[PDB]
Ligand binder design. Structure first.
Ligand SMILES: CCCCCCCCCCCCCCCCCC(=O)OC[C@H](COP(=O)([O-])OCC(O)COP(=O)([O-])OC[C@@H](COC(=O)CCCCCCCCCCCCCCCCC)OC(=O)CCCCCCCCCCCCCCCCC)OC(=O)CCCCCCCCCCCCCCCCC
Ligand SMILES: CCCCCCCCCCCCCCCCCC(=O)OC[C@H](COP(=O)([O-])OCC(O)COP(=O)([O-])OC[C@@H](COC(=O)CCCCCCCCCCCCCCCCC)OC(=O)CCCCCCCCCCCCCCCCC)OC(=O)CCCCCCCCCCCCCCCCC
Ligand SMILES: CCCCCCCCCCCCCCCCCC(=O)OC[C@H](COP(=O)([O-])OCC(O)COP(=O)([O-])OC[C@@H](COC(=O)CCCCCCCCCCCCCCCCC)OC(=O)CCCCCCCCCCCCCCCCC)OC(=O)CCCCCCCCCCCCCCCCC
Ligand SMILES: CCCCCCCCCCCCCCCCC[C@@H](O)O[C@H](CO[C@H](O)CCCCCCCCCCCCCCC)COP(=O)(O)OCC[N+](C)(C)C
Ligand SMILES: CCCCCCCCCCCCCCCCC[C@@H](O)O[C@H](CO[C@H](O)CCCCCCCCCCCCCCC)COP(=O)(O)OCC[N+](C)(C)C
Ligand SMILES: CCCCCCCC/C=C\CCCCCCCC(=O)OC[C@H](COP(=O)(O)OCCN)OC(=O)CCCCCCC/C=C\CCCCCCCC
Ligand SMILES: CCCCCCCC/C=C\CCCCCCCC(=O)OC[C@H](COP(=O)(O)OCCN)OC(=O)CCCCCCC/C=C\CCCCCCCC
Ligand SMILES: CCCCCCCC/C=C\CCCCCCCC(=O)OC[C@H](COP(=O)(O)OCCN)OC(=O)CCCCCCC/C=C\CCCCCCCC
Ligand SMILES: CCCCCCCC/C=C\CCCCCCCC(=O)O[C@H](COC(=O)CCCCCCC/C=C/CCCCCCCC)COP(=O)(O)OCCN
Lengths: 329, 56, 53, 121, 104, 175, 54, 64, 459
């Protein structure tokens, strides 16, 4: 009954099957990329249905199936949130990943390790799915670190190239700088609101203080390549073109903006953090556009364009219009 | 070959024999700490018609 | 060993505590009692030292 | 403790007569087993030093080592148990004979005892 | 299979010990300059230029192409600083002071 | 389902609207729901009925352990180790039960927040009040005890709190 | 790495102890074997114990 | 081999205590410790003073 | 508990009377069986403990460490199986005897319901370790490392004997149950201050605390693979385990007596993480990483909050497994390379791919990647420290960043890049090494499913 939960879980489940089959026989043939592409397309077509049901009715739901552990008065359970944001962002990401994998089936035909490349792409997609549909801060952190590790692994695809290793380490460094603020926010929320779940966080903080929002903004700036920690996004273009097209262009780099979107009931209650995030977005978008105005490498120009767009959606967050930022995403 | 593999594989029983010996020792050592059996203020229970001791 | 550890009997009394809490909350909500009591031990049994200062 | 000058002590007696009033240690006492193990270790070390097959050079010698160690361990355990029994007997007798120095404590209940509470923050 | 004399030693004061140390490190005597005899324990280890390892001749046929090294030369005291994966001192089109001024 | 009690986990009557098709265009949602039901729910239902009828052929029960009440640490001698042990065990069990009570209240609060949607700030005042009361009681009871907590430390904290509140009340009355 | 871990932390606890015990061992064990000095020290300690511990 | 030996095992035998080395050691090994001790002592003193005054709003601070 | 101690003792006659070409098989099989049997201790209850007898008791803190200790020995045998090929039968049997004695002493140490027995076995676990370090070591500096490891531990632990005997004379008993139940506050006096210092320093020297860690790099570098693994996996947890047990008597002195050690650890974790960045050696780098993690555990223990204790226990178990795996990988590289230098062999991922993915997984686990128990312990400790003071987050985050940096530096330098040209003895990896690292890593990814088994008694 109510197929919303069943289908919304089933898309994320079917996205995992080729990872399980990676040790089977099909992994050793040339049929694997087509298998992964077909799996992604089927997952997208299946996830298209909850979007229709939400559009018809306005369907929202959270599922807490597996109860991981209880620490005194705190419970950690594998809980997924299937609100408008997740149920709308899943099909877009799946569609883009399907197109990118079909393109990669032609771009990377000469790579001996193409099956491993497709497996890494699927792992990144699974981790981004985890991050998007997360409901408690710990699952969000799981996805947050998984996407960073996948970006590290895919940036340095060519191990012989020294610049690839340098860029991967640089991206990891900046993402850890963001994770500092993420961990600060997580600790503050647990120690003050006594829960990592978004529901209790939203109830218990009518006037959220400066520190947790500061930490969240720092993490969003770290992962969304804002002005303070921008260069990792332009320098992450040492990876293969499909990786840059999928990870560091449209899906992985919007994780910080998505995090700021998710905590919008708390951002409204504070006026200083809104000012700071608006200023950060404005300065970073102008700086990256000005840098792109004179670049000579095409991938560099598109990377700086991505950075400018991320700055624009951060500005959108600054003026208290999170839904418009989601639309722009 | 019987009585020949024993001269080479008699050592494999040492650990299992010691494990059984240790279980017996644990039971014997437990038998000396029955000074409060069925006398605790919380688990005090009336014996069944066919039980002699609450636990061994 | 992993299967044995997974199916270890609940000696930590996690379900027992949940059932006891359910019964306590139901009883205290039915009769209007104020759920948790701020005093762990009843004041009557406790004897205080009179200062008279 | 210094029970050397204890009255009514035979100068050179290993086990006084009153020591026969105590239960003798069982032949399966763990300490006796440890004496046997020490004797076996001594036998193995003797075999090793003389450059002989360590485990199976002299069975009679190892048996004699174990038996002598067990004998001395048994008698030593008897003497030790007697001495500890004497110590406890003297302690209880002296406590009984001097009630002034060992007054009965006024029993108290935690309900009427004020202990300082140091919070952890 | 290395003799005790091949290992580094104390800071040499006499010119004879300086020449022996310079010969040990496979470098010219007047091209060898040890660290100043301060408290720190550099000893008689040559003070190679603070030149990085990214700006070495990239077209030369090195024995270790990735590290841009040849078998047997004296190794910079701070090689793990300059491995092309870390800080490098390549000259820039714009001067350092002007770069700092503009960015600030 | 009867697996969980309704009084301890309250749920509103969940009133829902009726379909009022304004147009003649067939909505894909109804067709998708029908096909999903026909080709998903029926096999799952049949498998579950088979499993349940297999369970019914072999039925056995498990019981909930009941613990007697034992004297607290308040009626415990200074050095009576056995009564101290019994009271300490009882206090630990009560601590676990109170933790589960707080967990119950938190679960109800989170459910109220997600159910009410965009009016959660108004419709869930009662759950927030209950959580505030229970949280204040729990904090007054077991907070700041330390890692090596014990019944004696909780009793000492209660004694100190009662001393402070008695002094405050006496000062207010004599003011 | 060098100044704190490899120089000063080594100088404080282990190296200072090693140097002190080495110097004291050199001082104590360096006796010429002459009984004249031995018996003079014996007389000195006899006088010290007679006039100090009473 | 010479580089590794000079970096690892040839530092102490060539070390001499001088004004520069002693001052650097004292500063870089003592100053941070006392700085952090002062900072954390001040923070905890302020927090405990606020708790004693009762004006901290420690509600919902159940887990610690 | 004798069902654990007796088979471990019986392991010695089996090893000594086995055939000259079958000692390793018997030792491995029966150590694995002993670990399987010892797995039963994990069923602890929310009440006091599993009081087996008057001498041995098991808690929910002693159970995970006991399981890890019993599980380590087969891995030690598999790691030591390689470099002892050219050894005589008697010396191999002596090596296995030393390993079995170490396991038995650790097993008796971890339960040890009386504190004097705990101290006796805690100091007894030193002799086999010193013999292993100073006898079966390759480098000529093994003697100095053995002397440092002996004296740094013994000088710290000697005052603990006097303190424990004094506590027995005043309190009247050193049984841990009686000590816990009859605990009384310690007045702020000089005598109590020095008793606190005596009771604390003996364990703080072993973890170790920053400033007393000079013995750890030497002991870990100069020891053989088995010695390095047992040092980094279990022997470091002795101090942490001891501190949790002995902390109860001290209150409320610790509330202000923990400041110097808190500062030392919260700065030494940063210092050692930074040191890891500039290293010319692999085993030394892993040793300094172990020092940083143990400093974090020291902070957790000194904070004395429930979340601190759970995070501490999780971090001890996770770090033990991770560092044992890292030392295994370093030894596997060193055997082929015969040099033990990070930059000497490069680009091994082209030649050994399965070794490369083992390296990647080990580095990720060391990097504290969610949802591995490493990050569980890390995050619990960070939250507890934040509750202690809001400024600790700066130090903790800096430590996290530097840890990630040096872990990925270790991975990149030895795996990525162009291979070294003048090395042509990189034989394909055996089945033994792959099985060893698989058995190292799988328990971590299995424990991340059931964290409650390794979260300590305050769960
Ligand atoms: C995403 C979930 C997937 C679930 C599907 C089932 C997978 C089960 C795997 C169990 C553990 C793997 C075994 C470890 C050793 C690997 C064996 C090996 O040698 O490979 C050779 C083998 C054959 O390749 P080959 O060509 O012959 O050899 C060439 C070389 O090996 C060349 O090798 P390579 O180039 O192919 O690379 C090796 C590869 C594979 O090697 C590894 O790195 C494996 C280790 C990854 C873990 C990293 C440490 C962090 C701790 C994670 C804790 C989670 C564990 C949960 C329980 C696990 C039970 C064991 O490395 C990676 O792919 C990168 C890993 C980084 C991923 C970061 C994301 C982590 C968090 C993701 C979420 C997890 C929880 C979700 C919770 C919410 C959702 C419900 O390849 C594989 O077996 C690949 C397996 C698939 C990779 C799984 C990695 C992520 C999954 C972790 C556990 C799943 C959680 C449950 C979710 C279910 C839904
Ligand atoms: C706890 C300890 C308990 C035992 C205490 C001592 C007893 C035995 C020691 C005598 C030495 C014998 C010997 O050398 O071994 C060779 C011998 C085999 O070789 P072999 O061809 O016959 O003779 C070769 C020559 O002996 C000599 O061979 P090689 O000259 O051709 O080889 C040269 C080698 C030969 O050098 C050695 O073998 C050294 C001898 C061991 C030292 C003895 C120390 C005395 C006791 C101290 C124990 C300390 C414990 C405290 C913890 C701190 C650890 C230091 O020397 C070296 O390798 C140079 C460097 C040495 C390495 C570092 C030294 C460390 C020594 C510390 C040992 C501590 C643990 C002792 C455990 C037992 C070891 C035998 O081993 C044995 O046969 C005896 C082992 C025990 C026999 C058990 C049989 C009974 C089991 C069946 C019945 C089941 C019982 C339960 C019944 C209920 C079940 C239902
Ligand atoms: C636990 C976690 C980690 C922490 C552990 C690690 C860090 C803590 C432990 C290590 C740091 C403690 C070091 C402090 C004392 C160590 C100095 C020592 O051992 O003397 C050996 C060493 C042996 O003397 P020397 O070999 O006969 O003379 C060699 C120099 O060429 C002759 O020098 P000069 O004659 O040309 O000039 C010396 C003069 C000139 O003073 C100066 O040049 C600058 C002023 C320095 C002190 C005033 C501030 O200094 C003074 O007169 C100052 C007296 C007050 O003496 C020195 O070299 C040091 C003299 C300067 C004193 C600096 C002490 C200030 C540090 C803060 C306290
Ligand atoms: C190669 C490519 C992949 C191929 C493989 C495909 C298959 C995919 C599966 C891989 C992971 C998928 C995740 C699925 C998890 C389902 C199982 C899980 O739910 O069970 C866990 C249980 O697992 C165990 O708890 C974890 C294992 C225990 C760890 C011990 C390690 C083994 C000993 C070895 C030595 C130990 C060294 C360290 C000592 C501390 C959680 O238990 P719990 O949710 O509560 O409820 C269990 C049922 N109850 C209600 C009756 C109690
Ligand atoms: C090197 C690697 C690390 C090793 C371990 C280092 C940790 C050990 C350091 C010991 C911690 C502090 C020791 C004493 C702390 C008590 C607080 C005291 O120091 O402050 C004042 C004490 O005043 C002075 O400090 C008196 C002591 C001065 C002499 C001590 C030596 C100080 C410097 C030497 C440090 C050397 C440490 C390493 C030795 C090798 C407070 O004055 P007061 O309120 O009235 O007294 C409070 C105590 N009462 C309540 C019992 C009365
Ligand atoms: C697969 C092949 C078999 C297919 C037939 C079976 C289909 C399902 C029927 C099984 C019955 C349901 C079941 O498995 O039992 C529930 C059972 C646990 O029992 P509970 O009592 O509810 O909670 C534990 C406390 N007692 O749940 C499960 O284990 C199965 C589903 C769990 C989710 C799948 C695992 C994915 C996540 C892996 C772990 C990741 C790390 C932790 C995540 C962090 C979250 C904050
Ligand atoms: C905070 C302090 C951060 C200190 C950073 C410590 C790093 C030390 C070791 C790092 C490893 C060294 C390394 O990888 O090499 C540097 C590597 C190579 O340089 P490339 O440009 O990629 O060369 C390409 C041409 N060949 O580049 C890097 O990774 C540099 C990373 C250092 C970044 C430090 C600057 C961070 C400043 C943060 C301030 C902003 C705060 C946030 C603002 C928002 C607030 C709301
Ligand atoms: C009051 C007195 C307190 C006594 C404390 C005793 C501390 C125990 C360590 C004593 C070691 C002293 C021996 C020594 O250092 O000799 C110098 C020796 C010379 O080498 P040899 O092998 O003897 O000669 C070969 C060449 N011919 O120097 C060395 O090599 C040192 C090597 C081992 C160093 C070990 C130092 C470890 C000490 C750790 C600190 C603990 C100190 C104990 C007191 C704690 C402070 C309260
Ligand atoms: C890596 C090497 C580390 C070396 C660590 C060594 C330092 C350990 C701390 C000092 C240990 C000695 C303390 C003695 C054991 C405690 C026993 C006790 O508590 O008895 C006290 C007695 O306390 C003492 O006697 C202490 C005297 C100290 C003598 C030894 C000094 C050791 C060095 C002192 C400075 C070290 C402090 C910092 C060490 C940092 C590490 C270097 C009670 O006295 P009462 O007679 O009962 O009085 C009651 C009536 N009013």
């Amino acid at each position: 009954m109510n197929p919303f939960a069943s289908l919304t879980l089933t898309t994320l489940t079917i996205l995992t099957i080729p990872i399980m089959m990676s040790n089977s026989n099909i992994y050793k043939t040339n049929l694997y990329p087509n298998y992964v592409k077909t799996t992604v397309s089927y997952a997208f077509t299946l996830s298209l249905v909850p979007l229709l049901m939400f559009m018809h009715t306005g369907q929202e739901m959270i599922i807490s199936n597996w109860h991981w552990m209880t620490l005194q008065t705190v419970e950690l359970s594998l809980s997924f949130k299937m609100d408008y944001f997740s149920v709308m962002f899943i099909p877009v990401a799946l569609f883009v990943t399907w197109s990118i994998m079909e393109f990669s089936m032609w771009y990377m035909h000469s790579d001996p390790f193409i099956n491993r490349f497709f497996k890494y792409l699927l792992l990144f997609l699974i981790t981004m799915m985890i991050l998007v549909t997360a409901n408690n801060l710990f699952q969000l952190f799981i996805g947050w670190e998984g996407v960073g590790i996948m970006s590290f692994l895919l940036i340095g695809w060519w191990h012989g190239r020294t610049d690839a290793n340098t860029a991967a380490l640089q991206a990891i460094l900046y993402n850890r700088i963001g994770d500092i603020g993420f961990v600060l926010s997580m600790a503050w929320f647990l120690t003050h609101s006594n829960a990592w779940d978004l529901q209790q966080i939203f109830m218990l903080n009518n006037e959220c203080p400066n520190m947790p929002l500061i930490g969240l903004l720092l993490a969003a700036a770290g992962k969304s390549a804002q002005f303070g920690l921008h260069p990792w996004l332009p320098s992450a273009m040492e990876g293969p073109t499909p990786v840059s097209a999928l990870l560091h262009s449209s899906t992985m780099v919007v994780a910080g903006v998505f995090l700021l979107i998710r905590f919008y009931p708390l951002m409204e209650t504070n006026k200083l953090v809104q000012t700071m995030t608006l200023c950060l977005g404005a300065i970073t978008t102008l700086f990256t556009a000005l840098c792109a105005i004179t670049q000579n490498d095409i991938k560099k120009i598109v990377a700086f364009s991505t950075s400018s767009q991320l700055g624009l959606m951060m500005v959108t967050i600054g003026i208290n219009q999170p839904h418009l930022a989601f639309l722009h995403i | 070959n019987v009585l020949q593999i024993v001269r080479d594989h008699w050592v494999h029983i040492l650990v299992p024999v010691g494990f059984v010996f240790g279980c017996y020792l644990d039971r014997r050592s437990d038998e000396k700490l029955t000074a409060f059996r069925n006398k605790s203020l919380l688990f005090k229970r009336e014996l069944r018609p066919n039980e002699e001791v609450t636990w061994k | 060993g992993s299967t044995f550890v997974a199916y270890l009997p609940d000696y930590r009394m996690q379900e027992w505590a949940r059932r006891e809490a359910e019964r306590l909350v139901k009883y205290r909500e039915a009769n209007g009692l104020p759920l948790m009591e701020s005093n762990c031990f009843d004041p009557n049994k406790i004897q205080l030292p009179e200062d008279e200062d | 403790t210094m029970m050397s000058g204890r009255p009514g002590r035979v100068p050179l007696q290993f086990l006084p007569n009153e020591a026969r009033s105590l239960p003798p240690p069982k032949l399966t006492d763990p300490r006796l087993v440890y004496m046997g193990f020490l004797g076996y270790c001594s036998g193995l070390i003797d075999n090793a030093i003389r450059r002989r097959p360590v485990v199976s050079a002299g069975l009679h010698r190892q048996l004699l080592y174990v038996t002598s160690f067990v004998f001395f361990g048994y008698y030593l355990l008897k003497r030790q148990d007697y001495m500890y029994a004497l110590r406890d007997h003297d302690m209880f007798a002296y406590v009984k004979s001097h009630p002034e120095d060992f007054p009965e404590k006024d029993k108290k209940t935690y309900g009427e005892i004020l202990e300082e509470f140091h919070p952890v923050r | 299979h290395v003799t005790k004399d091949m290992f580094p030693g104390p800071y040499p004061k006499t010119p004879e010990e300086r020449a022996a140390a310079a010969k040990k490190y496979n470098m010219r005597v007047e091209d060898y300059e040890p660290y100043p005899d301060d408290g720190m324990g550099y000893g008689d280890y040559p003070k190679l230029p603070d030149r990085s390892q990214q700006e070495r001749d990239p077209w030369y046929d090195w024995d270790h192409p990735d590290l841009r090294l040849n078998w047997g030369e004296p190794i910079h005291w701070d090689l793990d600083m300059y491995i092309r994966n870390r800080v490098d001192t390549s000259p820039t089109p714009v001067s350092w002071n002007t770069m700092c001024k503009h960015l600030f | 389902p009867d697996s969980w009690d309704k009084d301890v986990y309250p749920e509103p009557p969940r009133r829902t609207p009726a379909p009022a098709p304004q147009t003649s265009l067939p909505n894909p949602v109804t067709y998708l729901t029908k096909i999903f039901d026909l080709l998903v729910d029926r096999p799952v239902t049949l498998a579950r009925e088979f499993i349940e009828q297999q369970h019914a052929k072999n039925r056995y029960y498990y019981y909930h352990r009941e613990f007697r009440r034992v004297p607290d640490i308040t009626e415990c001698e200074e050095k009576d180790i056995l009564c101290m042990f019994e009271a300490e065990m009882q206090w630990r069990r009560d601590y676990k039960v109170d933790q589960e009570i707080v967990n119950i209240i938190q679960e109800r609060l989170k459910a109220c927040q997600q159910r009410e949607g965009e009016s959660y700030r108004q419709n869930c005042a009662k759950e927030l009040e209950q959580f505030t009361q229970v949280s204040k009681a729990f904090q007054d009871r077991y907070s700041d005890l330390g890692a090596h907590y014990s019944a004696r430390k909780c009793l000492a904290k209660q004694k100190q709190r009662m001393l402070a509140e008695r002094k405050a009340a006496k000062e207010a009355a004599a003011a | 790495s060098s100044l704190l871990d490899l120089i000063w932390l080594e100088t404080i606890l282990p190296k200072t102890t090693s140097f002190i015990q080495m110097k004291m061992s050199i001082m104590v064990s360096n006796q010429k074997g002459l009984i004249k000095l031995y018996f003079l020290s014996f007389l000195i300690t006899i006088m010290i114990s007679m006039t100090l511990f009473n | 081999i010479r580089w590794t030996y000079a970096r690892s095992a040839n530092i102490y035998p060539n070390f001499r205590p001088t004004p520069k080395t002693s001052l650097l050691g004292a500063l870089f090994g003592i100053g941070p410790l006392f700085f952090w001790y002062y900072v954390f002592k001040t923070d905890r003193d302020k927090k405990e003073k606020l708790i004693q005054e009762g004006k901290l709003d420690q509600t919902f601070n159940i887990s610690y | 508990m004798l069902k654990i101690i007796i088979p471990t003792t019986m392991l010695l006659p089996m090893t000594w009377m086995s055939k000259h070409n079958m000692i390793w098989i018997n030792a491995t099989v029966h150590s694995l069986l002993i670990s399987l049997i010892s797995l039963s201790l994990l069923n602890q209850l929310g009440e006091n403990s599993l009081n087996f007898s008057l001498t041995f008791f098991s808690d929910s803190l002693s159970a995970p460490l006991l399981v890890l200790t019993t599980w380590l020995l087969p891995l030690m045998l598999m790691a030591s199986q390689s470099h002892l090929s050219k050894e005589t039968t008697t010396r191999k049997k002596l090596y296995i005897t030393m390993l079995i004695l170490l396991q038995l002493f650790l097993i008796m140490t971890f339960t040890a319901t009386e504190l004097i027995l705990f101290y006796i076995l805690f100091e007894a676990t030193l002799v086999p370790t010193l013999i292993i370090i100073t006898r079966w070591g390759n480098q000529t500096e093994r003697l100095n490392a053995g002397l440092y490891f002996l004296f740094y531990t013994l000088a710290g632990s000697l005052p603990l004997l006097v303190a424990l005997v004094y506590i027995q004379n005043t309190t009247g008993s050193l049984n841990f149950l009686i000590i816990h139940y009859w605990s009384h506050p310690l007045s702020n006096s000089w005598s109590n201050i020095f008793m606190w210092l005596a009771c604390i320093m003996a364990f703080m020297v072993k973890m170790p605390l920053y400033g007393l860690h000079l013995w750890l790099p030497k002991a870990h570098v100069e020891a053989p693979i088995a010695g390095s693994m047992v040092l980094a996996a279990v022997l470091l947890k002795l101090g942490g385990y001891g501190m949790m047990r002995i902390t109860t008597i001290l209150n409320p002195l610790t509330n202000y007596m923990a400041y110097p050690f808190l500062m030392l650890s919260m700065w030494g974790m940063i210092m050692t993480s930074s040191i890891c960045l500039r290293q010319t050696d692999l085993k030394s780098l892993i040793a300094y990483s172990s020092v940083s993690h143990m400093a974090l555990v020291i902070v957790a223990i000194m904070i004395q909050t429930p979340w601190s204790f759970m995070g501490a226990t999780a971090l001890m178990i996770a770090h033990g497994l991770t560092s044992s795996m890292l030392f295994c990988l370093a030894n596997t590289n060193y055997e082929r390379v015969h040099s033990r230098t990070m930059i000497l062999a490069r680009g091994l991922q082209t030649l050994l791919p399965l070794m490369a993915t083992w390296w990647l997984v080990a580095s990720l686990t060391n990097l504290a990647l969610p949802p591995s128990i490493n990050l569980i312990g890390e995050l619990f400790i960070i939250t507890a420290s934040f509750s202690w003071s809001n400024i600790t987050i700066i130090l903790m985050g800096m430590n996290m960043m530097i840890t990630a940096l040096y872990s990925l530096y270790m991975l990149i330098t030895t795996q990525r890049g162009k291979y070294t040209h003048h090395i042509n003895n990189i034989k394909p990896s055996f089945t033994r090494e792959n099985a060893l690292m698989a058995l190292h890593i799988l328990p971590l990814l299995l424990l991340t499913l059931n964290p409650k088994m390794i979260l300590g008694p305050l769960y």
